[PDB]
């Protein structure tokens, strides 16, 4: 979209969820810098009137700001032309089906909206893709996309590519079937949809899909139905509830798929042993856990790389695909950096999916490494949950080395990424499958999480995606479940789950400014400019999967609660973090 | 209470709801003043995890803060020893009966807690007087006082007298019978209770009640039975849901009663005309609308003055009674200043209730003045709603010249009060009484409100309670529903319903600092000191009666909703103020 390109190119705006199509989350503004960040102070705050995890970020287009709250997903439009104050312009309150609340696995969170040609597009938890007039907030059109009865809920933030609104949804834990569709920007009608599994026609494979990497899986083999048992692909997960990227020059949309569904691996293979089930090409559970590159016009996939075939830990691969150009191995190549849940930082050639680098960015014991030739992980049997009635320990836990919280990078130094990380393990015990009803809880496994190192759960690092070494490592008592933000002022912004919003030096990582906000910070900090002055805004309010024991009011005495999070939350004082929702803005 | 006197005498604390027994709401901390307030910035914020109106204020004792949220009335204990940061000590979540929400007339608010001898006392909306251990938050004792089935809800903040916990409740609009009782600070029973009407034995009228002012009403006449029709006193209102004060030297507790029940005056008298109904001593509806001075040990009343006999406007007299010594009429007299809802600022001799001054602090057209000789208002017929089916305009509206938002005064200059004010009128149309069921809405009147002057709703004034003239008047386009705070740094603090927190100069009223918070401010600002640094804290989140159309989600197309607030709220952009709940702390 030409308008999105113009807006995102202007450093004064935050026109895209991740600041641009490449999801760099980098701001060239330098008014706020290392020299004066000590004087950072709140300018104004805005309550959302809603309580639960406040994920995502606001959108800033010139003098206007748009905020999307969690369920019921209220859209607030604010006038910020004065910079040091705000004025509510209008409010859009969609009437939703509350069944989506109980059909949501990890919270009633929303990851933001997108803007283009005077229109605002967002996803409601009940699966509606809505387009509103940016000026008056009048509903231009809404299209029912996700079905709650099939276990699908639309948590992510869609993006706009030339004239289409592309997005997915979640629901692998409810037996849903992943889908990624495009809707006309002006009409809202569906143009095409690509399933994460099923026959080749259902996946919309390109004519030259993985032509350069036949070892990744090609068309004409119907891996979407064969790498699954009889018809488990119908409940085979693969939901795309993560972040979406776009390469204008190459005309490629990048997105990833979730887990293959239920957490009992024996039910995703006909083999009886871990060794036989992991036989290559037999039960890969494709195309779940795959990084896709599709053409926006038709949706045909140019290439696709599955990171975790035959999943056994719920290592959803949806994490954002940051696009940058890095000089590595003697030349400048168009790279795609992706911090996957499985604990591996993948560096791929965004032109054909070629594996450039794959290093562990957290403790990883389920796999030895990623085989460069076959592109498959060298799994460790004693750290792969397979049998029913046996608990197996694994690093990282189901939450992985990094969940949906996005990373940030400065393109001028594309090899150094600022990334929040999870540092806890788990013991997952598969259970017997009690039903095959789509739209109902479809996990069948008991989980227990202990933080790897007591007193240390989250870690904000300056990780070099080429050498696999971190410049600095900041350990935090609470998890680092907020997005990152890097600025040309020499600062890196992130927030902790107990409410601390911090600013650190990009070079050393020492904290230069910090303030404890109202609640846990699971939003993504943004940087924009109004009236010639720079502002930093971030959402607060505990929630998400990490905050489910609090937002859902679960019992702290049941450690298995929340898929293995209640016990860890109860042990690390999460229940003492009050709920909330509020946008904090700072200036110098 | 001895402990309370010392904690309140120490300027570093805010140990009482109104900073002290006299409710002066004045802080001597000059560490923050008129020359550096421009640099006042937020130090930290704490979300309550609860929505709707956040009235009241926190309690700072040493370096421990206690905050009482609105329903379910969660009590948060914060460790503020670090000063610029906070840590939760404990949390108390009471199990309540949800009908208290539907039985609450004007939002699910709470006005704070009191502290003494390591104990925290507060009121739950469902009518429970709770005492918690300050250190651990454990429940020391719980006593059921207010009955929801009888239309009673406990919104006010109790205070701790020597060894008694005294409090009242609300529910005049539900046909409740007002009561004011005391409870043992250690065990928790009711030591005594005094009704606002009924036989003299129920009102606890001492042998020397109104000795120096027989024209007020004396014991032995059973006015609480005569001034009402046959048995309407059973639903005679008089609830004491306002602020309570205490004079240790005189050993007297000060509290006032509310309206006498329904808003259809023809049902609170057996006369057929306004003149006959207003005959003195016939239908006074005593002891509603009465300022009471009682002995804490027995509860017997030393004196009582009814400001509005035979109420016809719902001019609840519960407003705070600030106790100060003022040099007037040739000498320094122990006074009681009270900005009543009827629009008159009463200055009475706190020893016997003698009327010293009665000045109009806002536009008042229902009464010409207050006669000293009779102590009764000179009513204006054309502005006194009486008959059924006749809309009658009145200044001020039912919300009065000033609702529960407390005023502030510096005893150094006891004649000048910093008081928020309401500046809108109404057209009240009495209606036929459809029922006599206690516990159900008991009003029977169609109300419509409109600001007296366009573009002006609230006004923060510097009012001389002796001369009746205002030093300065600050007009606000939104209501000034927040309490006031005055400091020895030459500053006065208050907030607006749209979220603006302001710091004005005491001498001129000029705004020296202002910031828009997350939501409407209906909380009371406080000043305290920790680690040698002065801090300013206030609660935010729209609510209360003024904000009920937003918190209750009332139809904006129903002007009569919220007892007339909906129409005015819909016209002055109240619906664009998001809900919230968050405590903000500032420092220089
Ligand atoms: O597999 C799915 O269908 C699905 C959805 C979501 C979601 O929609 O929020 C999460 C997950 N899976 C998941 O595995 C996960 O760890 C997770 C964390 C969060 C969050 O917002 O904090 N959502 C989700
Ligand atoms: Nd998942
Ligand atoms: Nd009332």
Author numbering:
A (entry chain B), B (entry chain A): 32 to 619
Q: What text appears in the publication on this structure?
A:
Remarkably, the same elements are actively taken up by methanotrophs/methylotrophs in a range of environments, since their XoxF-type methanol dehydrogenases require lanthanides as a metal cofactor. Interestingly, XoxF does not form a complex with a small subunit, but forms a homodimer. Here, we report the purification and characterization of the XoxF1-type MDH from the acidophilic methanotroph Methylacidimicrobium thermophilum AP8.
By cultivating M. thermophilum AP8 in medium supplemented with 0.5 μM Nd2O3 as the sole lanthanide at μmax (0.051 h−1) on methane, we aimed to study a functional neodymium-containing methanol dehydrogenase enzyme and determine the structure of the catalytic site. The crystal structure of Nd-XoxF1 contains a dimer in the asymmetric unit, of which one monomer contains no PQQ molecule and the other contains a PQQ molecule and neodymium ion with approximately 70% occupancy. The loss of the PQQ cofactor from the enzyme is interesting and could be a combined result of the exchange of buffers and the high salt concentration used during the crystallization procedure. The two monomers show the typical eight-bladed β-propeller fold of a methanol dehydrogenase, a conserved disulfide bridge above the PQQ cofactor and an aspartate residue coordinating the lanthanide in the active site. They can be superimposed with the structure of the cerium-containing XoxF2 of Methylacidiphilum fumariolicum SolV to a root mean square deviation (RMSD) of 0.8 Å. However, a detailed comparison of the Nd-XoxF1 structure with those of other XoxF-type and MxaFI-type MDHs reveals an interesting difference in the direct vicinity of the active site, namely, position 172, which directly precedes the Nd-coordinating Glu173, is occupied by an aspartate residue in Nd-XoxF1, whereas this residue is a glycine in all other known MDH structures. Amino acid sequence alignments of a large variety of methanol and alcohol dehydrogenases reveals that the presence of an aspartate residue in this position is diagnostic for the XoxF1 lineage. To accommodate the Asp172 side chain, residue 240 is a cysteine in Nd-XoxF1, whereas it is a bulkier threonine in XoxF2 of M. fumariolicum SolV. With respect to the XoxF2 structures of Methylacidiphilum fumariolicum SolV, the presence of Asp172 (replacing glycine) results in a rearrangement of the loop containing the metal-coordinating Glu173. The coordination of PQQ and the lanthanide are almost identical to the coordination in other XoxF-type MDHs, and therefore the overall coordination of the lanthanide is not altered in XoxF1 compared to that of other XoxF-type MDHs.
